[PDB]
Amino acid sequence: ILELTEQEELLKFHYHTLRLYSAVCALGNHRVAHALCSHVDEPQLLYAIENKYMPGLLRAGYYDLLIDIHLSSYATARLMMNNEYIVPMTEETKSITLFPDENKKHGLPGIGLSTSLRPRMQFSSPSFVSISNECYQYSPEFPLDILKSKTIQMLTEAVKEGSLHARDPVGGTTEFLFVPLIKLFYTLLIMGIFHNEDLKHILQLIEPSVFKEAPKEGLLQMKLPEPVKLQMCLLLQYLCDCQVRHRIEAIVAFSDDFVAKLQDNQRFRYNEVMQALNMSAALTARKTKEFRSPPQEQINMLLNFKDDKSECPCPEEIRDQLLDFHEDLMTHCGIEKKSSTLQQLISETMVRWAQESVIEDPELVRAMFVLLHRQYDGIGGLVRALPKTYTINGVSVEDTINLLASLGQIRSLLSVRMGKEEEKLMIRGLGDIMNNKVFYQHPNLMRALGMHETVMEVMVNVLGGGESKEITFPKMVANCCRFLCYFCRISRQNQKAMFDHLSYLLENSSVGLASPAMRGSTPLDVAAASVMDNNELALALREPDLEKVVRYLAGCGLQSCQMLVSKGYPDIGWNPVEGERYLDFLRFAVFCNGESVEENANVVVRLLIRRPECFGPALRGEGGNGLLAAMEEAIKIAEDPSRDGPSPEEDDTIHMGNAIMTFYSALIDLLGRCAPEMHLIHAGKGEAIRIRSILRSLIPLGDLVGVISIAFQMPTIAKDGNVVEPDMSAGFCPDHKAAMVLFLDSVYGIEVQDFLLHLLEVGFLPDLRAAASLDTAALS
Amino acid sequence: NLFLQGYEKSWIETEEHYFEDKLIEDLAKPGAEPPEEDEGTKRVDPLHQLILLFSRTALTEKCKLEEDFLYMAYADIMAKSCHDEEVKSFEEKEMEKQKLLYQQARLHDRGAAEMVLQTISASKGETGPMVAATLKLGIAILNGGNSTVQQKMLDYLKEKKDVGFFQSLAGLMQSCSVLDLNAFERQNKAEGLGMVTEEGSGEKVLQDDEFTCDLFRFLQLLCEGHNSDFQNYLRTQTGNNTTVNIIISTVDYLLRVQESISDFYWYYSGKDVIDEQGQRNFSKAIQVAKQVFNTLTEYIQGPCTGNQQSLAHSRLWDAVVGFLHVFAHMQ
Amino acid sequence: IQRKAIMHHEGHMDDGISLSRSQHEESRTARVIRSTVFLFNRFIRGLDALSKKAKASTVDLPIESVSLSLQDLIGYFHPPDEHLEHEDKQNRLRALKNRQNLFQEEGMINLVLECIDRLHVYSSAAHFADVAGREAGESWKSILNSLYELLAALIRGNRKNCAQFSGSLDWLISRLERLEASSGILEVLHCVLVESPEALNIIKEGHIKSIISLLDKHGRNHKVLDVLCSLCVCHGVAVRSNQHLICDNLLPGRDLLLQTRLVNHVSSMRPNIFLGVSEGSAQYKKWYYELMVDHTEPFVTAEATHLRVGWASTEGYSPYPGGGEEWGGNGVGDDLFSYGFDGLHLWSGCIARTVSSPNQHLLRTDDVISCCLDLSAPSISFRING
Amino acid sequence: GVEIETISPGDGRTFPKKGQTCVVHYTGMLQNGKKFDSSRDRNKPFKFRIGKQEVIKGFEEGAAQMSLGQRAKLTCTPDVAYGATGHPGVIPPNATLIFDVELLNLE
Predict the structure, then answer these.
(1) Which long-range contacts (CB under 8 A, 24 or more apart) does B309-317 make?
(2) Is D56 considered catalytic here?
(3) Are A139 and D51 in contact (CB under 8 A)?
(4) Is the Cβ–Cβ distance between A399 and A436 less than 8 Å?
(5) Using an 8 Å Cβ cutoff, are B170 and B120 in contact?
(6) Is C345 left (phi over 0), alpha (psi -120 to 50) or beta?
(7) Which of A343, A662, B30, D76 has the lowest tally of Cβ within 10 angstroms?
(8) Structural gaps in chain B: residues followed by a C–N separation over 2.5 Å
(9) Where in the numbering of this chain does the B30.2/SPRY domain appear (chain C)?
(10) What distances in angstroms separate CA B104 from CA A700, B148, B150, B221, one per listed residue?
(11) Closest CA to B212 of B235, B178, B180
(12) CB pairs under 8 A between A and D
């Protein structure tokens, strides 16, 4: 293979073959990596890495192939997990300090005790004799100690040799000599294979004077080409990340005993107040008001003592403890001669490079200036890191590790094309995340990890990929919707963070509405969960979104249902099945926590009366029959086949009669909840009287009375007395009467004794008598 | 966890240290040129390289101006270095003015004005942190009515025939927000029910008052010093295929602000006592309207007959009448 | 909206028209579009006339005009050169994108495809000249190459163009095997796969197998390999199906891609004697010697240690051992000039045959091998131990 | 199904049995001589349990017929190693496998 330095055709073909080998196993294709381990072996890889007469292109290709086969997957996993700090609280965590000793000198980055949770590192042994087929999880094994020792030795040799500026670099070019080797070193350092001693040695190699622990020049001061400068910038970026992680862990360690002191003290103050509550009720009230505030406000106002701020009741001892720790943290961050520090070293090196050469690579310019800004703004690192910092107790460590592994699996699958196996894998991951307890017990950790964002990225990938033509993988959309609904339900803050995406969800609200057995797993359901039982978000709802929902409802009321007419259902001129869900979402929008929202109710009523087609064939006018006539016709349709079913199991049966009845009931319930309140009617708000008059004009009293008077079908016990229960998915469910009564009470109201008695005679009393007759145990 | 969040919000975030002037001086220093010994084409300094990178990114054709982490950081650094901030004497006042001129030269000698114009043009009228930082940097460079920066900006606009700059400027002008009596009453009802979300105080009323003030102060600084060239170019662009009347757009926004202020006046007319948040909103709206009035006064201050005729034929009179009504009854 | 434009006797109130000027580039592109439509329709009509009835006369076939227009269009759809300034490059890229969009919206991709299809009904230049004469026969291959280059330039770097061509990809791949169209079709396919993800979504197993068959039956072309690389991943997103198909259909064969292994260096040592047989020569024809091995590690490295003993023959009275390589990898019996014995096999011409012997075992420590050579009747014999 | 001949003799009596872990150290080549797997490359002996369908039963039977400390060459037909499906990416369909197996230890 060393003869390829003079055979250009074979050299190019083999280089592109190595590129194809990398491509086929790119992005965590462990099966393909295991297969490639046969064609390219560990001894061949090591020989290619170590040989000095290797052609540059083949050397780079083999370095890339080694990294992709054996290290890329775990390196990518760890680098993805990097920007999140989950620090379990143990005695090891508590033992962490900002500085190694009293002398405030920065230690070398990386070395020390770090307790932040990191992804588990696992490899599978490549063996084609075995038939287990379970080795296709995890990347193939490789000798990590041997690779690390070889990398250190080769980097030392390269530093010693290139310092002489010889005309014989490995690969024929300084780039070919350094870029692959430094890329391998950076990958290993990202993986965290290097221990304390090897970290010390390689930091000495990178820069001897700055990293010296108490002529010869490091890699930073060597007059590097641009790709090597970019790799060095990546290395310094990782070192800064290590410093930030150490700072975060030290902050958590201090926060432990600081919070321990604060909590015991607050208990003492509350006990003192309870012992001395007797001077005045008012004085006790506004001195215990601090305890009545939410815990976030308690923490904030207990910490509100940075400058003066006598409102803070924190004693001077605890204040001095926090102040001393804050001063230590600022000194470590560098807020307040040999550089002797990574911050200076990076700053001077970047400025020197920029003023030494006109950099032709925009990526290099951006990396260098990002690094310089990060060095100067040490506070910004903590500002971005602390929101992503979460602490847990020891008992939750294993569950948190499992949840992080599942989240990493989902995030990794985000980088591959959507397929059947990918759908299966990520559905399994989402289900595991459901069954994990930390998901329920730590909503703030979930939001900090931003899991809803990843799930919606998956959702967008599935939907926007030609959702207009056909939605491929609807099971995945259903699973994502279920996940997002549970995420809404877990916490109120999760609901608010979820509410930010109402526009997209309402835009794609028509994904799986008309298909049963997937209710509660549609984007409309996700939006309804986001708005559910939250007065703030219900008020934050907007007329454009409500108008979008009303337009969708009008389209449903004007046009038929395409899947149903294709499947064989009779073609009626409207879509009750899809309209009902929009009505339900509007009901959630206008009604919240047992009370109506006046603004939303008025807006919805105005939009509905602007577009009268939303009420269906009946209630539209110009030849539309009454509500009672429509309900009776729907009852007849449900009873009679060839009009209720398709006539060419719940997927095949839609029960159009029940669909129509449920749509009308939902519309009536929505109008009843949109109706104003009786005290406001007494006050005399012209808008309220207008709304009531509009609703009364829409719904005649006689129609409601007749629908309430419509009889039911009770079960019978005949032919040996076995219970014959009529099917309810086709029948007249009492929820329709419940909606009727809700509207009747809210809009019309019953005040006249004569009207109440007539309504009792023609309406409820038959139902009461039938319910009494159904007192038989088997019938009950 | 609660303590960590509170510490981040109260102590770490509130920490402020001043480094922008030193950092930009270090970037501007060329350094070790004779040691470099090449000197083939008078190499550029790191600050010039950074400004060139940002300008090339802005000039690159894209459908949407993507947010730039780096552009936030360095535009803020540049503006802070530019401003670098009782009775004082004429000598020290002139010293401060000369220092400001030198600090603005440090940037506009390297293409900062062209970067600002390019970024505003690429914003395409969509409000965001990009255009906010760009406007802040432009204000910092143009503070005091920098004639050199004004000339550079006008020359660049005329040479490039940038209709997109004015189109995006106008789009931002309509995108600027005003007072919102609806969603102010919603906030009042939320306060009445008593429980507030974990998010900060509702700023839906006057969504970006700082952004609006920055935009109109940028326009005022463009026209500052009775610069007839800008005063006429904003009204009409001779060399461009399409023209946009910035003066009339400013009049339209002023009318919108006047209508919103009248809306809050009528809301608070019955109530004897002004609520604290209503006073907040009134103060912010008054500040925005004051900035708009100053911008118009700068349009017309140095006698510009075209701008004066445009204002006379515009809807300024209705806004002035409404403002007079509001002034009288608030008094 | 599709509002019909008519003439009325009084019109309407809203009948005013505003005028918007067109850019000079747009006007030039539109006129170029008209000219190319005219010329290519003439060419297509001529090809159809020849195909229907071989008149070979009274048919235009503007070969020179088509070639010149193809060259002009290729120059027109040229990416800006890299040494140009950044803003000039941006302006030229914008102009190129506008030109491509205008051509696609006028439908010139289909016109180029139709011309290529009409040209592909003739297998060879001589076959085309059979119906069109030598000038057209000679220019046939050049016109096909220019048409493919024009298609690649038209759809290169344009996501809309590549997405629209995704539906026509199958027709393109259907003619990979034609020699005259291989390079152009490969370049066009590479552009489409690099740009449009829908291209990858449409590509199936049969197309991948056709590409691998192109590799198998056309040689070692790295552009095909780059096309496979582009099929593997696009825009940082991997296609597991494509990766699995490429792996399972390319790697296990080990007959197309170059194969690599680690081979122990092998050194050969000989005494100073030279045994030869010739008519009237004074050299004895029977010879005997022994080799005793004191130490042998079966596996110094991951590959078994090589140890063979025997006789090697020179090539025509020359002290150089005939055949074989000087450096390493090959030992005794790895050529038709040497004859060796490794303990289990008889090596000659790099082919091993198992030989039976008492206590059949590979050469190990404390082993004596006796080699006998006879040239009266040419024969080499071995005796392990006694 | 698997056909075995020696390379270095073993002890001749110690054989794998019921429920034992054979620690072998092998290298695998196709019938054309191309190598496809080797425990020597990974520098780790291959441990597998007897009678529990962990390996291809051609390899299983060869190891069972071997003795402790022995080196043997095993030829496995396609019907006993991987069938007509092959192993995707490394073993092609209907491939006869050749193994140089050394029985390092029994446990």
Answers:
(1) B310/B235, B310/B245, B310/B247, B310/B248, B311/B247, B311/B251, B314/B247, B314/B248, B314/B251, B315/B251, B315/B252, B315/B255, B316/B251, B316/B254
(2) yes
(3) no
(4) yes
(5) no
(6) beta
(7) B30
(8) 85
(9) 213-386
(10) 75, 10, 12, 14
(11) B178
(12) 50
Q: Residue B167 is encoded by which pair of tokens?
A: 């189109």
Listing DSSP states for B279-301 in one string gives: HHHHHHHHHHHHHHHHHHHHHHS
- Catalytic residue check, D48: no
Q: How was this structure determined?
A: cryo-EM
d(CA A505, CA A527) in angstroms, rounded, equals 6
Are the C-beta atoms of B198 and A493 separated by less than 8 Å? yes
Record: contact C87-B61, CB cut-off 8 A: no
Longest CA–CA span in chain D (Å) reads 39
Helices and strands (H, E) in chain A, number of each type: 38, 8
Q: Token digits for D106?
A: 């029994």
Q: Do B241 and C90 touch (CB under 8 A)?
A: no
C261 touches chain A (CB under 8 A): yes
CA B69, distance to chain mean position in Å, is: 19
Give the integer Cα–Cα distance in Å for C261 and B249: 75
A508 SS3 class: coil
B vs D contact (3+ beta-carbon pairs below 8 A):
no
| Structure's resolution in angstroms | 3.3
Task: Outline where DSSP puts E strands in A136-281.
Answer: 139-140
Q: What is each CA distance from B78 to B17, B22, B27, C37, in whole angstroms?
A: 15, 11, 11, 55
Amino acid identity, position A408: G
Residue with tokens 């008001």: A289
Nearest CA in chain C to B241: C21
Nearest to B166 by CA among B224, B111, B239: B239
In terms of residues, how long is chain B?
331
| HSE-CB for C330 with a 13 A CA cutoff | 19
Query: Is D50 known to be catalytic?
Result: no
Residue tagged active-site, from D46, D59, D82, D91: D82
Residue of D nearest to A129 (CA): D55
Q: Which residues of C touch A419 (CB under 8 A)?
A: 240-241
Whether residue A614 contacts residue A575, with contact meaning beta carbons closer than 8 Å, is answered with no
Residue D36 annotated among the catalytic residues of the structure: yes
The neighbours of chain D, by the rule of 3 or more Cβ pairs under 8 Å, are: A, C
Burial class (CB in 10 A: 0-12, 13-18, 19+), A388: middle
* Pairing assessment for the beta strands C237-238 and A722-724 based on DSSP bridges: unpaired
Lookup: tokens for A158:
């390269």
Nearest CB among C228, C240, C244 relative to A20 is that of C228
What phi-psi label fits residue B199: left (phi over 0), alpha (psi between -120 and 50 degrees) or beta? beta
